[PDB]
Symmetry: D2
Subunit: 258 residues, 4 copies
């Protein structure tokens, strides 16, 4: 099948990439980074997130595999010493949900797809937004920002903000607060919120309309913003799996002991 | 249809109950508290939880309705002044997931059904249990206790322990920690965990085998315990709904402003 | 005595300022905004913080008074209707501790004084600093930022970040974390830290040396930073008090009920 | 001088105790467990807490030393291999603040002294108390319980409940909440509170007057309780120190890395 390999760029990941290509040259495999069937990421989670956004236009034709040259990553869960055994076996596919973000401007829409999370923060001044859940006004948020996480992203920024860890078989999204103000006049829910499919969470500005909006590792300053809509995407990321590595085991090895 | 009405027991709830029975006497309604089709709870959330466990053996034949005589309850979401309009209309059914708890003793099983949560605490001494997720050892918990919550229960004990709020259309359960110890030798995940259907969480004792186990308002001291198993139940609670009162709106009215 | 009055700038605060000046014109009072003995702030807490930094060079000769035209402020604790009674009485002085911040650059020092807090965040990239307590390396922090709060500032940014509320008679400073990363390789204390006088907390960069450093409402991007030192200042802010308004009462009225 | 040695009771701690007594027999030392000048605790922190309460009536005549046979303890900060060097040197004294607890019954007072903390929980039913700070009603607490911690106790139960870590040179006490209820009708401060000397925190029952009250490792069910008063004690615990082992270093070795 057609395949490609991306590398972290350091000495360890580049030469591991060249050896897998050589191993692939001994089979019916064509290296094609335009229309690959298999995308192998050699490096860390940030290297994997880059590989995902590289091919976000062909998600339903691609199965991703991650090899962790540094420590263990949640998306890169193959060790380098198991690379040759990986070449040979190259199985079943597993799918994780994704988050769809829509940004509307006063006076052309822009949509984005997130594998970890999308966050909103102020352009420098204070951050005030109204939070609207399915056209019903839920709260007015004053604080540092908000974070909307996929299931597989709940172990990332979401986890540092007090959010729950969520098994990736649950099609959902989770909203966490970043340092909300709560006193006699300002009031937020103060708990993470977990939304199912077809629920739309909208963020609407109260005064300032410039926001720093992130999607995974990308962060862009958006101006003249009127609304930011979140919902569980209809698209999914597909992984190539060759052995049982359960999510809760991977959580254990990354946070408890390994 | 056959119906019954339970009351908080105070003056307000008893006479509201008698007036609804009189209103029901003007229709083809039979008061039957042995095999009711409709169970109306007049009082608070604790009154509703009592009504649920009253008829936990006939959940698939019963639609529950709650009337809040005190403040607004998450399960009792009808005002007393709307009682006569409720008698007449007596619709669609909505279903919430439930939590199944299995307690095994050394040397007869015992199962329970929870609408809010089930919690485990020590019998007086220190609380130490091993947490096993789908036969894989996840962590050894040292602390005050653990809490396993349904979706509709996430706004109850779960919320006070830092857990996420979870829409009840998600068939899941959430585990929160009660004051875990974390230092150089003791280590827990420290985040709430959200499990899907068919995932089994088992709690196994390390030394002491006596535990205070709660299921909603009930709390019993269990002795010679070998295991406590949690999983999303196959049974569901069915509500009779007559108008749109979304979960996120009900969360807003109970915690933000009303 | 010599005095001055600063205003929020809106219609309510400006005309309340003019009426107090007229009332002061009926006594032995000289309006002097160069060397005042009394500084009256009419507006909110942000208006008060501006008044404090206006005269941070003459703190030991000035007693501050705050009048809250909007809601109740923690520093502006006089109601507008009590302005004429305030003119007449114009007592004892009470003193609150302050935080001293020292910023050193590679290749001229810069010092600052904070009434609420001082915070450090990254210039855009990831935030990594080593935390040194009295020349002993305590931890390497990876996250969004850190916050060092005075006692009276513990109800402000500090409170939103999970910090403790600290009575202002305690000469101390409190360090809170902003979304620290904690996994198998990255580790922080995760608890607020409360330091006494003469303890010096130093923050040292690991890679990037550009930081967004805030002191109360001011926030400046600092470049070529080598160290950021925190310690309880030797200077104190002095308030003019005319009646008993205890700190814990003021906390109650601002967060519990009023 | 007069001295005594208490042991954890296991094989390691008993024979280390006998060897130190033999080493002490080669000097002008008298083993006296009635009126000791020096109290050596060989074991863990719980062994040390037992030693403290053993001699709480003669705190101003006793200097405590702790040897950790198991892991490193916050109070037992001497390694077993350094026992003979400890015998010879047997210096300066350092003092840590303590917490005084007063329990009043309807229809004889009872006072207690705590080195870690004192906690209040319900006798089985729901826990509701009014919190009074210096005769001013602060809040009505509904939840699982409350915890009042000394500075050296802030790394113990206090830390697990979200409290701040507090250097023991600060004469203060810290109150943390155990799973408070917060909704439209019930409201607590939700933040840890740090009190200075001479501040009195009183807990008063609302309905049930039976409480489970703990002081360090002791926990007794108290009945017909009218009030529970907390304040920084006038008594202090004195340690014998032979080398520099700073508090923040000890925190680092116990929670970060060792
Ligand atoms: N304050 C802050 N606290 C916590 N996380 C924060 C954060 N600010 C940003 N992030 C995160 O950084 C992501 C972009 O960087 C690549 C990645 C990843 C990344 N993804 C995951 C993941 N799904 N699960 C676990 N760990 C992850 N990681 C690890 O994340 C750690 C640090 O990035 C490294 O251990 C990675 O292995 C961004 O999408 C956001 O999730
Ligand atoms: N420390 C502690 N913090 C927080 N909650 C704690 C708790 N200890 C026990 N509970 C809870 O008490 C339940 C049994 O009592 C009946 C109920 C309910 C009850 N159920 C819900 C619910 N599903 N959602 C919201 N509020 C609820 N309530 C409100 O719960 C409030 C107090 O009970 C009242 O406002 C009720 O209206 C038990 O199942 C456990 O969820
Ligand atoms: N995410 C975030 N969460 C929480 N607080 C954050 C924050 N980001 C910044 N701040 C804060 O903003 C301060 C500068 O603005 C003036 C002030 C004050 C201000 N000071 C205090 C104070 N000492 N105590 C209580 N409330 C205060 N206030 C209230 O603070 C509320 C909002 O500013 C208004 O109710 C003010 O009445 C800055 O020093 C930092 O403490
Ligand atoms: N849910 C819960 N979470 C957290 N701590 C809880 C708790 N319930 C009770 N405790 C605590 O247990 C104390 C009585 O036991 C002896 C001690 C000590 C003890 N004291 C300290 C201390 N000052 N600092 C650090 N660690 C300590 N320790 C360690 O505490 C750990 C477990 O006890 C062991 O590592 C000890 O080394 C009681 O006073 C209360 O502080």
């Amino acid at each position: 099948m057609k395949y490609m390999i991306t590398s972290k760029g350091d000495e360890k990941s580049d030469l591991l990439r060249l050896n897998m290509i050589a191993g692939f040259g001994e089979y019916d495999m064509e290296y094609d980074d335009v229309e690959p069937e298999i995308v192998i990421s050699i490096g860390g989670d940030g290297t994997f997130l880059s590989a995902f956004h590289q091919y976000e236009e062909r998600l339903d034709e691609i199965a991703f595999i991650g090899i962790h040259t540094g420590h263990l990553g949640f998306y890169a869960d193959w060790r380098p010493a198991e690379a040759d055994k990986l070449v040979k076996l190259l199985y079943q596919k597993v799918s994780y949900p994704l988050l769809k973000t829509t940004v509307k401007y006063g006076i052309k829409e822009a949509t984005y797809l997130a594998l970890n999370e999308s966050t909103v923060k102020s352009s420098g001044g204070p951050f005030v937004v109204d939070v609207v859940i399915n056209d019903i006004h839920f709260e007015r948020f004053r604080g540092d920002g908000l974070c909307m996480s996929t299931p597989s992203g709940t172990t990332a920024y979401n986890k540092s903000l007090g959010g729950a860890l969520m098994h990736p078989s649950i099609e959902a999204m989770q909203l966490t607060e970043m340092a909300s103000i709560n006193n006699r006049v300002y009031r937020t829910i103060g708990s993470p919120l977990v939304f199912p499919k077809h629920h739309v969470v909208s963020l609407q500005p109260v005064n300032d309309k410039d926001f720093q909006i992130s999607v995974d590792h990308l962060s862009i300053l958006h101006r003249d913003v009127q609304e930011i809509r979140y919902e569980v995407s209809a698209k999914k990321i597909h992984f190539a799996r060759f052995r049982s590595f359960p999510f809760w085991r991977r959580v254990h090895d990354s946070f408890i002991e390994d």
